Amino acid sequence: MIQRTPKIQVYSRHPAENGKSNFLNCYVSGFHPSDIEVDLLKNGERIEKVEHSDLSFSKDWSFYLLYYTEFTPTEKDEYACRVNHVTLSQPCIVKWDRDM
């Protein structure tokens, strides 16, 4: 009826420091309807134990969710967030950059 594609941001809870434990986040927002598939990847392969926040929404009725998981960043390991939705005709991958 009225559908809106999600906005995505991948990042860490604390400033990234190689060899130190941290949490990898993927914040999806501005979408409708609420059915959404979100995964965290490490060198292409998806991570098993990923948790998320309780479904809530914004003033314009669009939804928002936070997916997160424990990780140890390094100089060569690549981390990304894969998202799928009714609006997306192709799954959207977004890579993690330590200064974003």
Partner 1 sequence: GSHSMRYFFTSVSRPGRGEPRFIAVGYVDDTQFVRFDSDAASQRMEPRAPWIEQEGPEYWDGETRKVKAHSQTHRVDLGTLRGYYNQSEAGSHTVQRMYGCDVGSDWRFLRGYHQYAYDGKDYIALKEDLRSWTAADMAAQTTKHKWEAAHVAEQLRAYLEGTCVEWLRRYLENGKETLQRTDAPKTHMTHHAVSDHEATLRCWALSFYPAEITLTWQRDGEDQTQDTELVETRPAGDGTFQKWAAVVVPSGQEQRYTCHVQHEGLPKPLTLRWEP
Look up residue 40 and give its amino acid.
L
70 touching partner 1, by CB under 8 A: no
- CB nearer to partner 1: pick between 25 and 44: 25
Q: Which of residues 1-40 bind partner 1 (CB under 8 A)?
A: 1-4, 7, 9, 11, 13-15, 23, 25, 27, 29, 32-35
What are the strands, taking DSSP E only, across the chain? 7-12, 22-31, 37-42, 45-46, 51-52, 56-57, 63-71, 79-84, 92-95
- CB nearer to partner 1: pick between 64 and 93: 64
